[PDB]
């Protein structure tokens, strides 16, 4: 079984696209492999230097992933900056990185040195742990390939010291029909207040269809989100309500509201428990950092032989 | 009230007479009334070479050489760069405050790109690391060479950026360009590049070769010799006090001794002058753990200041 490593964005608020799209699958994969996952809070600094906001974002990211089912016993789960080894490997990988490689990168292309450089720091996270597989999206594919390129450059020079990582890649619709995404501001958040959740579900864009008539559920965003929360029978019963007529889109929102609350009630409660007693969160994160620091310290020793430390 | 002076010492190359009468003696003598921080810059060395076995022994040799020439771990803070790891982290942080054009215009990179050669990310980024070195220790003065000053200006710009954003986090550092030239074997200023050096930590054989290579006029053995023009006399002056040097020109202006003999004299002068350094040098490498203890001590003092500084930083970045 291959080593799968995921960096996790601390920034922002987790939404149900994230959940049914990435996380749920990842949480169910914790049995067939030792997963490694980290809140990349180092990368978070390229786009912000408000410390207090960054700090909170990390605690909150931490708690959110745990409550959605990351089990720190099965997997290796930690805060990036807790394993400082990556920082020194970053420096070493830089010496093997041609500028051109970075100039042609895409999050920069598409301007601080942090922003230009972060692909090397990413290669360091990947390479430090002999990652076989990096689960990403299209947007992050060439970052993985850049780490693989750095790896080949180092191997040629030092012998095979690094595993060559390989990138691995059904849409949740957002509020407006598009892919749900923070950047489109069309999301339904998981850890928000009931009041905020009702507002988000209210913004869902609908047909003009009149309350009295049959509504098309095949093209209704409300029905598409709801599909995520129901089996075939619950989906049939709501389809029958669309067709029958006599209920408005507003009635369906109330229903989606209750579906979304019920579904995440536990994760929400666990989240709040984690943030009310943060000494437990720290402990979970410290425990994950220990397992990762042990793998990292051991790769580093081998690097140190090659680089003379 | 002695302001903090910080100097990065390159681990590569062989130290020579010029390195000593030129820069090192002054640094060693500054220790008493100055507050000196000096580190062996082994992270920077990594941009030039990735050959670990060489890099390690250059680092050791370097540390042993400076200690030998008079760096006092008790008066000073002296350490190997890589022993104080906070510096890597500060390097990441400063990158967030470092504008690209500030690096695209750095000489080292510019000039590399001009020749037509390709550049590592390391080469491009080293100015930020350098700036982390400077700023991590609240450096007041960075002793610098006539062309190296851009480095300090870069740190100074990053410093302002961060302070603008977070308040008084950094002391703004200042280049101090240092103040007689040491003649090389060929008459030109002695430097590694010119291959005109007389090394300090060499065999008796290698010293003799280098000294014997010194170039001279064809003033015959028996005839008076113009000291005021001889390179042997120029160099010999560095090892000799007032009476010592006059005693010697008397030998020149009397005739009777030839340059071959003066070269023999010069050998004994250099050998004697550096004997205690050379023997100290050899012990530190032969008994690697006395060296280690001293570099650990140094690293311990540097690390305390770096930690007090990273504590401030951690507050502001949320770590």
Coordinates of C-alpha atoms in Angstrom, one line a residue:
Chain A
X1 CA 0.0 0.0 0.0
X2 CA 1.4 3.4 -1.1
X3 CA 2.1 6.5 1.0
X4 CA -0.5 9.2 0.4
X5 CA 0.2 12.7 1.7
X6 CA -2.2 15.6 1.6
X7 CA -1.5 19.1 2.6
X8 CA -4.6 20.8 4.0
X9 CA -5.5 24.5 3.6
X10 CA -6.1 26.2 6.9
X11 CA -7.5 29.2 5.2
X12 CA -11.2 29.8 5.2
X13 CA -14.3 27.8 6.0
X14 CA -14.9 24.2 5.1
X15 CA -17.9 23.6 2.9
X16 CA -20.0 20.7 1.8
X17 CA -18.2 20.6 -1.5
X18 CA -15.0 20.0 0.4
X19 CA -16.8 17.3 2.4
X20 CA -18.5 15.1 -0.2
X21 CA -15.8 16.1 -2.7
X22 CA -12.5 15.4 -1.0
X23 CA -12.7 14.8 2.7
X24 CA -15.2 12.0 3.1
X25 CA -13.3 9.8 0.7
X26 CA -10.0 10.6 2.4
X27 CA -11.6 9.8 5.8
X28 CA -12.8 6.4 4.6
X29 CA -9.3 5.6 3.2
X30 CA -7.7 5.7 6.6
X31 CA -8.1 1.9 7.0
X32 CA -6.4 0.7 3.8
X33 CA -3.3 2.9 4.4
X34 CA -1.4 5.0 6.9
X35 CA -2.5 8.4 5.6
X36 CA -0.4 11.5 6.2
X37 CA -2.1 14.8 6.4
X38 CA -1.0 18.3 7.5
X39 CA -2.5 21.7 7.9
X40 CA 0.0 23.6 5.7
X41 CA 0.1 26.7 7.8
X42 CA 3.5 27.7 6.4
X43 CA 1.9 28.2 2.9
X44 CA -0.8 30.2 4.6
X45 CA 1.8 32.9 5.3
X46 CA 2.4 33.7 1.7
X47 CA -1.0 35.3 1.5
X48 CA -1.3 36.8 5.0
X49 CA 0.7 38.0 7.9
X50 CA -2.0 38.7 10.4
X51 CA -0.8 36.3 13.1
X52 CA -3.9 36.1 15.3
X53 CA -6.1 35.3 12.3
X54 CA -3.5 32.8 11.0
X55 CA -3.3 31.1 14.4
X56 CA -7.1 30.7 14.8
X57 CA -7.4 29.5 11.2
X58 CA -5.1 26.7 12.1
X59 CA -6.8 25.6 15.3
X60 CA -10.1 25.8 13.5
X61 CA -8.8 23.9 10.5
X62 CA -7.4 21.3 13.0
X63 CA -10.7 20.9 14.8
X64 CA -12.7 20.8 11.6
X65 CA -10.7 17.9 10.0
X66 CA -10.8 15.9 13.2
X67 CA -14.6 16.4 13.7
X68 CA -15.2 15.3 10.1
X69 CA -13.4 12.1 10.9
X70 CA -9.7 12.2 10.7
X71 CA -8.5 9.7 13.4
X72 CA -5.1 10.7 14.7
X73 CA -4.5 7.1 15.8
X74 CA -4.9 5.5 12.3
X75 CA -3.3 8.3 10.4
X76 CA -0.5 10.8 10.8
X77 CA -1.9 14.2 11.3
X78 CA -0.1 17.3 12.2
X79 CA 0.5 21.0 12.0
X80 CA 3.1 21.8 9.3
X81 CA 5.2 24.3 11.3
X82 CA 5.5 21.8 14.2
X83 CA 7.9 19.7 12.0
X84 CA 10.6 22.4 11.3
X85 CA 12.8 19.9 9.3
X86 CA 10.9 20.8 6.2
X87 CA 12.3 24.3 6.3
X88 CA 15.9 23.1 6.1
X89 CA 15.0 20.6 3.3
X90 CA 13.4 23.5 1.5
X91 CA 16.8 25.3 1.6
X92 CA 18.5 22.2 0.2
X93 CA 16.0 21.5 -2.6
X94 CA 16.5 25.1 -3.7
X95 CA 20.0 24.4 -4.7
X96 CA 18.7 21.8 -7.0
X97 CA 16.0 23.9 -8.5
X98 CA 16.5 25.8 -11.8
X99 CA 14.8 29.2 -11.8
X100 CA 13.1 28.4 -15.1
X101 CA 11.2 25.6 -13.4
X102 CA 9.6 28.1 -11.0
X103 CA 9.2 30.9 -13.6
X104 CA 6.9 28.6 -15.6
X105 CA 4.8 27.7 -12.6
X106 CA 1.3 28.9 -12.5
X107 CA 0.0 30.2 -9.2
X108 CA 2.8 32.8 -9.6
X109 CA 2.6 33.1 -13.4
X110 CA -1.1 33.6 -13.5
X111 CA 4.7 39.3 -6.2
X112 CA 6.7 38.4 -3.1
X113 CA 9.5 35.8 -2.9
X114 CA 7.2 33.7 -0.6
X115 CA 4.8 33.3 -3.5
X116 CA 7.4 32.6 -6.1
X117 CA 9.1 30.0 -3.9
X118 CA 6.4 28.0 -2.3
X119 CA 6.5 25.2 -4.9
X120 CA 9.9 24.3 -3.5
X121 CA 8.6 24.3 0.0
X122 CA 5.8 22.0 -1.3
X123 CA 8.3 19.6 -2.8
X124 CA 10.0 19.5 0.6
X125 CA 6.8 18.4 2.3
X126 CA 6.3 15.7 -0.3
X127 CA 9.8 14.5 -0.5
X128 CA 10.4 14.5 3.3
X129 CA 8.0 11.6 3.7
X130 CA 8.7 9.5 0.6
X131 CA 5.3 10.3 -0.7
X132 CA 4.1 8.0 -3.5
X133 CA 0.8 9.7 -4.1
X134 CA -0.3 13.3 -3.7
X135 CA -4.1 13.7 -3.9
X136 CA -4.7 17.1 -5.6
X137 CA -6.9 18.9 -8.1
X138 CA -6.0 20.0 -11.6
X139 CA -4.9 23.3 -10.1
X140 CA -2.1 21.7 -8.1
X141 CA -0.9 19.1 -10.6
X142 CA 2.2 20.9 -11.9
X143 CA 3.3 21.4 -8.3
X144 CA 3.5 17.7 -7.8
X145 CA 5.3 17.4 -11.1
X146 CA 7.8 20.1 -10.0
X147 CA 8.6 18.1 -6.8
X148 CA 9.0 15.1 -9.0
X149 CA 11.4 17.1 -11.2
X150 CA 13.4 18.2 -8.2
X151 CA 13.5 14.6 -7.0
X152 CA 14.9 13.5 -10.3
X153 CA 17.5 16.3 -10.2
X154 CA 18.7 15.2 -6.7
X155 CA 18.6 11.5 -7.5
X156 CA 20.9 12.0 -10.5
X157 CA 23.3 13.8 -8.3
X158 CA 23.1 11.8 -5.1
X159 CA 21.7 8.3 -6.0
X160 CA 18.1 7.4 -5.3
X161 CA 17.4 9.3 -2.1
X162 CA 13.8 10.3 -3.0
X163 CA 10.6 8.5 -4.0
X164 CA 9.1 10.1 -7.1
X165 CA 5.7 11.4 -6.1
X166 CA 2.7 11.0 -8.3
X167 CA -0.3 13.3 -8.5
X168 CA -3.7 11.7 -8.1
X169 CA -6.9 13.5 -9.2
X170 CA -18.4 14.2 -9.3
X171 CA -19.1 18.0 -8.8
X172 CA -20.9 19.3 -5.8
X173 CA -22.8 22.3 -7.1
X174 CA -22.6 25.6 -5.3
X175 CA -25.3 28.1 -4.6
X176 CA -25.5 29.4 -8.1
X177 CA -25.2 26.2 -10.0
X178 CA -21.4 26.4 -10.5
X179 CA -18.8 24.2 -8.8
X180 CA -19.1 25.1 -5.1
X181 CA -16.0 27.1 -4.2
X182 CA -14.8 29.7 -1.7
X183 CA -13.7 31.9 -4.6
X184 CA -17.1 31.8 -6.3
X185 CA -18.7 32.7 -2.9
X186 CA -21.4 30.1 -3.6
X187 CA -20.8 27.7 -0.6
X188 CA -22.8 26.1 2.2
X189 CA -20.4 25.9 5.1
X190 CA -20.3 23.1 7.5
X191 CA -19.3 24.8 10.8
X192 CA -21.4 27.8 10.6
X193 CA -24.3 28.9 12.9
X194 CA -27.9 27.8 12.1
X195 CA -28.6 31.5 11.2
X196 CA -25.7 31.6 8.7
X197 CA -26.7 28.2 7.2
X198 CA -30.2 29.4 6.6
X199 CA -28.9 32.5 4.8
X200 CA -26.6 30.4 2.5
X201 CA -29.4 27.9 1.7
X202 CA -31.7 30.9 1.0
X203 CA -29.3 32.2 -1.7
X204 CA -29.7 29.0 -3.7
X205 CA -30.7 30.1 -7.3
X206 CA -33.9 28.6 -8.6
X207 CA -36.3 28.5 -11.6
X208 CA -39.0 31.2 -11.7
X209 CA -41.5 28.3 -11.7
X210 CA -44.7 29.1 -9.9
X211 CA -45.6 27.5 -6.6
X212 CA -48.6 25.7 -8.1
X213 CA -46.9 23.8 -10.9
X214 CA -44.5 20.8 -11.4
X215 CA -40.9 21.9 -11.0
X216 CA -37.9 20.4 -12.8
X217 CA -35.8 18.6 -10.1
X218 CA -33.2 17.5 -12.7
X219 CA -32.0 21.0 -13.1
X220 CA -32.8 22.4 -9.6
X221 CA -29.7 23.3 -7.5
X222 CA -31.7 22.6 -4.4
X223 CA -32.5 19.1 -5.4
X224 CA -28.8 18.6 -6.5
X225 CA -27.5 19.6 -3.1
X226 CA -30.1 17.5 -1.4
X227 CA -29.1 14.4 -3.4
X228 CA -26.0 14.4 -1.3
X229 CA -28.0 14.0 1.8
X230 CA -30.5 11.3 0.7
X231 CA -30.6 7.7 -0.6
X232 CA -32.7 6.6 -3.6
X233 CA -35.9 6.5 -1.5
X234 CA -35.5 9.9 0.0
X235 CA -34.6 11.2 -3.5
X236 CA -37.7 9.7 -5.0
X237 CA -40.0 11.2 -2.3
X238 CA -38.6 14.7 -3.0
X239 CA -38.8 14.2 -6.7
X240 CA -42.5 13.3 -6.3
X241 CA -42.9 16.6 -4.4
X242 CA -41.3 18.6 -7.2
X243 CA -43.6 17.0 -9.8
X244 CA -46.8 17.0 -7.8
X245 CA -46.7 20.8 -7.5
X246 CA -48.2 22.8 -4.6
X247 CA -44.9 23.4 -2.7
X248 CA -42.5 26.2 -3.5
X249 CA -38.8 26.3 -3.7
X250 CA -38.9 27.9 -0.3
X251 CA -40.4 24.7 1.2
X252 CA -37.6 22.7 -0.3
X253 CA -35.0 25.1 1.2
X254 CA -36.5 24.4 4.7
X255 CA -36.1 20.7 4.0
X256 CA -32.4 21.1 2.8
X257 CA -31.8 23.2 5.9
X258 CA -33.0 20.4 8.1
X259 CA -31.1 17.8 6.1
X260 CA -27.8 19.7 6.3
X261 CA -28.1 20.4 10.1
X262 CA -28.9 16.8 10.9
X263 CA -26.1 15.5 8.7
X264 CA -23.4 17.5 10.4
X265 CA -24.8 17.8 13.9
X266 CA -22.1 15.5 15.4
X267 CA -19.2 17.0 13.6
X268 CA -20.4 20.5 14.6
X269 CA -20.6 19.4 18.3
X270 CA -17.2 17.7 18.2
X271 CA -15.8 20.9 16.6
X272 CA -17.1 23.1 19.3
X273 CA -15.8 20.7 22.0
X274 CA -12.4 20.9 20.4
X275 CA -12.3 24.6 20.4
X276 CA -13.7 25.0 24.0
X277 CA -11.0 22.8 25.4
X278 CA -8.0 23.7 23.1
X279 CA -5.5 21.9 25.3
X280 CA -6.9 18.7 24.0
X281 CA -6.5 20.0 20.4
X282 CA -2.9 20.9 21.1
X283 CA -2.3 17.4 22.5
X284 CA -3.8 15.7 19.5
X285 CA -1.7 17.8 17.2
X286 CA 1.5 17.3 19.3
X287 CA 0.9 13.6 19.1
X288 CA 0.6 13.7 15.4
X289 CA 3.7 15.8 15.2
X290 CA 5.7 13.2 17.1
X291 CA 5.0 10.5 14.5
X292 CA 5.8 12.8 11.6
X293 CA 8.9 14.3 13.3
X294 CA 10.2 10.7 13.6
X295 CA 9.8 9.9 9.9
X296 CA 11.2 13.4 9.1
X297 CA 14.2 13.2 11.4
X298 CA 15.1 9.9 9.7
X299 CA 15.0 11.1 6.1
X300 CA 16.9 14.2 7.3
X301 CA 19.8 12.0 8.6
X302 CA 20.2 10.6 5.2
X303 CA 20.1 14.0 3.6
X304 CA 22.6 15.3 6.1
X305 CA 25.1 12.5 4.9
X306 CA 24.7 13.8 1.3
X307 CA 24.9 17.5 2.2
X308 CA 27.4 17.1 5.0
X309 CA 25.6 18.1 8.2
Chain B
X1 CA 27.9 50.0 25.2
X2 CA 29.3 48.1 22.2
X3 CA 27.0 47.7 19.2
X4 CA 26.6 44.3 17.7
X5 CA 28.8 43.4 14.7
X6 CA 28.1 40.3 12.7
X7 CA 30.3 38.6 10.1
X8 CA 29.6 35.6 7.9
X9 CA 32.8 33.7 7.3
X10 CA 33.1 31.7 4.1
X11 CA 34.0 28.0 4.7
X12 CA 35.7 27.6 1.2
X13 CA 39.3 28.1 0.1
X14 CA 42.7 28.2 1.8
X15 CA 43.3 31.1 4.2
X16 CA 46.4 33.1 3.3
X17 CA 48.7 35.9 4.4
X18 CA 46.4 38.5 3.0
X19 CA 43.3 37.1 4.6
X20 CA 45.2 37.5 7.9
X21 CA 47.1 40.8 7.8
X22 CA 44.2 42.1 5.8
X23 CA 41.0 41.2 7.7
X24 CA 41.4 38.6 10.3
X25 CA 43.9 40.2 12.6
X26 CA 41.7 43.3 12.8
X27 CA 38.6 41.2 13.6
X28 CA 40.5 39.1 16.2
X29 CA 41.7 42.3 17.9
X30 CA 38.2 43.9 17.8
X31 CA 36.9 41.1 20.1
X32 CA 37.9 42.9 23.3
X33 CA 36.0 46.3 22.9
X34 CA 33.5 45.2 20.3
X35 CA 30.6 42.9 20.5
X36 CA 31.4 40.3 17.8
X37 CA 29.2 37.6 16.4
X38 CA 30.9 35.5 13.7
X39 CA 29.5 32.4 12.1
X40 CA 30.7 29.9 9.6
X41 CA 28.3 30.3 6.7
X42 CA 27.8 26.7 5.8
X43 CA 24.2 27.2 4.4
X44 CA 25.5 29.6 1.8
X45 CA 28.3 27.1 0.9
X46 CA 25.5 24.8 -0.3
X47 CA 24.7 27.0 -3.2
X48 CA 28.2 26.5 -4.6
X49 CA 28.6 22.8 -4.1
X50 CA 26.3 19.9 -3.1
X51 CA 29.3 17.6 -2.4
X52 CA 28.6 16.8 1.3
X53 CA 31.8 15.1 2.2
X54 CA 33.8 18.2 1.0
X55 CA 31.4 20.7 2.6
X56 CA 31.7 19.1 6.0
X57 CA 35.5 19.1 6.1
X58 CA 35.6 22.7 4.8
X59 CA 33.3 23.7 7.5
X60 CA 35.5 22.0 10.2
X61 CA 38.7 23.3 8.6
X62 CA 37.2 26.8 8.5
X63 CA 36.2 26.7 12.2
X64 CA 39.5 25.3 13.2
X65 CA 41.4 28.0 11.2
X66 CA 39.6 31.0 12.7
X67 CA 39.8 29.7 16.2
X68 CA 43.5 29.2 15.5
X69 CA 44.1 32.7 14.3
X70 CA 42.7 34.1 17.4
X71 CA 38.9 34.0 17.5
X72 CA 38.0 33.6 21.2
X73 CA 34.8 31.7 21.9
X74 CA 34.6 33.3 25.3
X75 CA 34.9 37.0 24.2
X76 CA 32.8 36.4 21.1
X77 CA 29.9 34.5 19.8
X78 CA 31.2 32.0 17.2
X79 CA 29.2 29.3 15.6
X80 CA 28.5 27.2 12.6
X81 CA 25.4 28.6 10.8
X82 CA 23.6 25.4 10.5
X83 CA 23.7 24.8 14.3
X84 CA 21.2 27.7 14.7
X85 CA 18.2 26.4 12.8
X86 CA 15.8 29.3 13.7
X87 CA 17.4 31.1 10.8
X88 CA 15.7 28.9 8.2
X89 CA 12.3 29.6 9.5
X90 CA 13.0 33.4 9.7
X91 CA 14.1 33.0 6.1
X92 CA 10.6 31.7 5.1
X93 CA 8.9 34.5 7.0
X94 CA 11.1 37.3 5.4
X95 CA 10.3 35.9 2.0
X96 CA 6.7 36.9 2.5
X97 CA 7.9 40.5 2.9
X98 CA 10.5 40.4 0.1
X99 CA 9.6 41.9 -3.3
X100 CA 10.8 40.0 -6.4
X101 CA 12.5 43.0 -8.0
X102 CA 14.7 43.3 -4.9
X103 CA 16.1 39.8 -5.8
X104 CA 16.0 40.1 -9.6
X105 CA 18.4 43.1 -9.2
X106 CA 20.8 41.4 -6.8
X107 CA 24.3 41.5 -8.3
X108 CA 25.1 37.9 -7.7
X109 CA 22.1 36.8 -9.7
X110 CA 22.1 39.6 -12.3
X111 CA 25.7 38.9 -13.2
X112 CA 25.2 35.2 -13.4
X113 CA 22.3 35.7 -15.8
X114 CA 24.4 38.1 -17.9
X115 CA 27.2 35.7 -18.7
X116 CA 24.3 33.5 -20.0
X117 CA 24.5 30.9 -17.2
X118 CA 21.4 29.4 -15.5
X119 CA 20.7 30.1 -11.9
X120 CA 19.5 28.1 -9.0
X121 CA 16.6 29.1 -6.9
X122 CA 19.2 29.0 -4.1
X123 CA 21.4 31.5 -5.9
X124 CA 18.4 33.8 -6.4
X125 CA 17.2 33.4 -2.8
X126 CA 20.4 33.6 -0.8
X127 CA 20.0 37.4 -0.2
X128 CA 16.9 36.6 1.9
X129 CA 18.8 34.0 3.9
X130 CA 21.6 36.5 4.4
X131 CA 19.1 39.0 5.6
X132 CA 17.6 36.5 8.0
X133 CA 21.3 36.0 9.3
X134 CA 21.7 39.7 9.9
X135 CA 18.2 40.4 11.3
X136 CA 17.8 37.3 13.6
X137 CA 20.6 38.7 15.8
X138 CA 19.6 42.4 16.0
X139 CA 22.9 43.2 14.1
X140 CA 23.9 46.9 14.3
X141 CA 27.0 46.6 12.0
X142 CA 27.8 44.3 9.2
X143 CA 31.5 44.6 8.2
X144 CA 31.5 44.5 4.5
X145 CA 33.6 44.8 1.4
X146 CA 33.5 47.6 -1.1
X147 CA 31.2 45.7 -3.4
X148 CA 29.3 43.5 -0.9
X149 CA 27.2 46.3 0.5
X150 CA 24.2 45.5 -1.6
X151 CA 23.6 42.6 0.7
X152 CA 23.1 44.9 3.7
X153 CA 20.8 47.2 1.8
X154 CA 18.6 44.2 1.0
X155 CA 18.4 43.3 4.6
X156 CA 17.7 46.9 5.4
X157 CA 14.7 47.0 3.0
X158 CA 13.3 43.7 4.3
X159 CA 13.6 45.1 7.8
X160 CA 11.6 48.2 7.0
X161 CA 8.9 46.2 5.3
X162 CA 8.4 44.0 8.3
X163 CA 8.6 46.9 10.8
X164 CA 6.1 48.9 8.8
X165 CA 3.7 46.0 9.1
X166 CA 4.4 44.7 12.6
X167 CA 6.1 47.5 14.5
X168 CA 9.6 47.6 15.9
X169 CA 10.6 44.0 15.3
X170 CA 14.0 44.8 13.8
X171 CA 17.1 46.9 14.2
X172 CA 18.1 48.3 10.8
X173 CA 21.6 47.2 10.1
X174 CA 24.4 49.3 8.5
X175 CA 27.3 48.3 6.3
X176 CA 30.6 49.4 7.6
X177 CA 33.1 49.2 4.8
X178 CA 36.5 48.4 6.3
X179 CA 39.3 50.9 6.2
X180 CA 47.2 48.6 3.5
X181 CA 47.3 46.0 0.7
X182 CA 49.1 42.6 1.0
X183 CA 51.3 42.0 -2.0
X184 CA 50.9 38.6 -3.7
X185 CA 53.8 36.4 -5.0
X186 CA 53.5 38.0 -8.4
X187 CA 53.5 41.6 -7.2
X188 CA 49.7 42.0 -7.5
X189 CA 47.4 42.2 -4.5
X190 CA 47.3 38.7 -3.0
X191 CA 44.1 36.8 -3.7
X192 CA 43.0 33.2 -4.3
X193 CA 42.0 34.2 -7.9
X194 CA 45.4 35.5 -8.9
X195 CA 47.2 32.3 -7.7
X196 CA 49.7 34.5 -6.0
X197 CA 49.1 33.5 -2.4
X198 CA 51.1 32.3 0.6
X199 CA 48.9 30.0 2.6
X200 CA 48.9 29.8 6.3
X201 CA 47.9 26.2 7.0
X202 CA 50.0 24.3 4.5
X203 CA 53.0 21.9 4.5
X204 CA 56.5 23.2 4.8
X205 CA 56.9 22.1 1.2
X206 CA 53.9 24.1 -0.1
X207 CA 55.1 27.3 1.8
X208 CA 58.6 26.9 0.3
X209 CA 57.2 26.5 -3.2
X210 CA 55.0 29.6 -2.8
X211 CA 57.7 31.6 -1.3
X212 CA 60.2 30.5 -3.8
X213 CA 57.8 31.7 -6.5
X214 CA 58.1 35.3 -5.4
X215 CA 59.4 37.4 -8.3
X216 CA 62.4 39.6 -8.2
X217 CA 64.8 41.8 -10.2
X218 CA 68.1 40.5 -11.4
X219 CA 70.2 42.5 -9.0
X220 CA 73.3 40.3 -8.7
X221 CA 74.1 38.5 -5.4
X222 CA 76.9 40.7 -4.2
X223 CA 75.3 44.1 -5.0
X224 CA 73.0 46.3 -2.8
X225 CA 69.3 45.6 -3.3
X226 CA 66.4 48.1 -3.4
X227 CA 64.2 47.0 -0.5
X228 CA 61.7 49.6 -1.5
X229 CA 60.8 47.6 -4.5
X230 CA 61.2 44.0 -3.6
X231 CA 58.2 41.8 -2.9
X232 CA 60.1 39.6 -0.5
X233 CA 60.9 42.7 1.6
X234 CA 57.3 43.9 1.2
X235 CA 55.9 40.7 2.6
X236 CA 58.7 40.1 5.2
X237 CA 57.8 43.5 6.7
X238 CA 54.5 42.0 8.0
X239 CA 56.4 39.7 10.2
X240 CA 58.9 42.3 11.6
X241 CA 58.9 45.2 14.0
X242 CA 60.8 48.4 13.6
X243 CA 64.3 47.3 14.4
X244 CA 63.4 44.0 12.7
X245 CA 62.6 45.7 9.3
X246 CA 65.6 48.0 9.6
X247 CA 67.9 45.3 10.6
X248 CA 66.7 43.7 7.3
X249 CA 67.1 46.6 4.9
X250 CA 70.6 47.0 6.3
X251 CA 71.1 43.4 4.9
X252 CA 69.7 44.6 1.5
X253 CA 71.6 47.8 1.3
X254 CA 74.9 46.2 2.3
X255 CA 74.9 43.6 -0.5
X256 CA 76.4 40.2 0.2
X257 CA 73.2 38.3 0.6
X258 CA 71.1 37.3 -2.4
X259 CA 67.3 36.9 -2.9
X260 CA 67.6 33.2 -2.5
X261 CA 68.8 33.8 1.0
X262 CA 66.2 36.4 1.7
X263 CA 63.6 33.9 0.5
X264 CA 65.1 31.4 3.0
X265 CA 64.8 34.1 5.7
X266 CA 61.2 34.8 4.7
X267 CA 60.4 31.1 5.1
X268 CA 61.6 31.0 8.6
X269 CA 59.7 34.2 9.4
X270 CA 56.3 32.8 8.1
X271 CA 56.9 29.4 9.7
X272 CA 57.7 30.8 13.1
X273 CA 54.9 33.4 13.1
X274 CA 52.1 30.9 12.4
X275 CA 53.6 27.9 14.2
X276 CA 51.3 28.2 17.3
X277 CA 48.2 28.7 15.0
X278 CA 49.2 25.7 12.9
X279 CA 49.7 23.5 15.9
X280 CA 46.4 24.6 17.4
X281 CA 44.8 24.0 14.0
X282 CA 46.0 20.5 13.7
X283 CA 44.8 19.6 17.3
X284 CA 41.3 20.8 16.6
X285 CA 41.0 18.6 13.5
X286 CA 42.9 15.7 15.0
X287 CA 40.8 15.8 18.1
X288 CA 37.4 16.7 16.5
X289 CA 35.6 16.8 19.8
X290 CA 37.4 19.8 21.3
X291 CA 36.2 21.6 18.1
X292 CA 32.7 20.3 18.6
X293 CA 32.4 21.5 22.2
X294 CA 33.5 25.0 21.2
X295 CA 31.1 25.2 18.3
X296 CA 28.3 23.8 20.5
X297 CA 29.1 26.5 23.1
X298 CA 29.0 29.1 20.3
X299 CA 25.7 27.7 18.9
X300 CA 24.3 27.9 22.4
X301 CA 24.9 31.6 22.8
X302 CA 23.7 32.4 19.3
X303 CA 20.5 30.2 19.8
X304 CA 19.4 32.1 22.9
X305 CA 19.3 35.4 21.1
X306 CA 17.7 33.8 18.1
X307 CA 15.0 32.3 20.3
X308 CA 14.2 35.5 22.1
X309 CA 13.9 37.0 18.6
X310 CA 11.7 34.2 17.1
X311 CA 9.5 34.5 20.2
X312 CA 8.6 38.1 19.1
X313 CA 8.1 36.9 15.5
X314 CA 5.9 33.9 16.5
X315 CA 3.6 36.4 18.3
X316 CA 3.2 38.4 15.1
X317 CA 2.8 35.5 12.6
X318 CA 0.7 33.3 14.9
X319 CA 3.1 30.5 15.7

